[PDB]
Each structure stands twice: as structure tokens, then as C-alpha cells.
Amino acid sequence: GSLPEVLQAPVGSSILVQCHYRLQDVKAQKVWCRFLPEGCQPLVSSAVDRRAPAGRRTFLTDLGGGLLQVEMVTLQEEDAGEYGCMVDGARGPQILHRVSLNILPP
């Protein structure tokens, strides 16, 4: 729909996000990116069954079969912002899902 996934988390908490892609696209790389003024900046790309790190606290795992698991662990203040899951295969890139992460005040 119209809005991203909207999350609220205090510093130190952890989240699990699931992005979904088409079965036709198992072989394509997928990407976790951060929305910045220029565009959605790629942070890490996926590989089937591999837990792929971005930074120190984010991990992207393509399980196969259409599931793209995201983990963001022990959140820090600077993690606040909006992120995307993208598919980047031969028919051109698509944004699968957006995630707005709001870090709660102390």
C-alpha cells in the first residue's frame, strides 16, 4: 500500500523484518539499502542461504523460495531512518518493501 512498514524500537532492541520476492527471482541478487537524499544506498547484497552482514548489526539472508530475512540487532540511535529491500535481477530493479525505523527517546 501507501506506507512503509512502520517500526518503533528503543535503543538496544532487536527486530526481524521479512521481505518477499517472486519465485522467478531466486537466482537474482537482492539488496538491503538505506534511503538517503541521493537514493536508496545499497548496504549489502544477498546470496542464497548465506547470512550477509551490513555494518555491525544488520544481516540479510535469502532463504530461497521467496523469503528475504532481515535482522537488525541491538539497535543504536543512528540506525533510525528508512530502508528498502530490492530485487536486482535481469528484468530490472524493484523495491520489494520499505521499512521506517524510529528509535524511541530515552
Curated annotation (Swiss-Prot):
It comes from Homo sapiens (Human). Detected in platelets, monocytic leukemia and in T-cell leukemia. Disulfide bonds join 19-85, 33-40. It is found in: Cell membrane; Cytoplasm. Residues 1-102 form the Ig-like V-type domain. It comes from the Eukaryota. Cell surface receptor that may play a role in the innate and adaptive immune response. This is Trem-like transcript 1 protein. Phosphorylated on tyrosine residues. When phosphorylated, interacts with PTPN6. When phosphorylated, interacts with PTPN11. Residues 1-106 are extracellular.
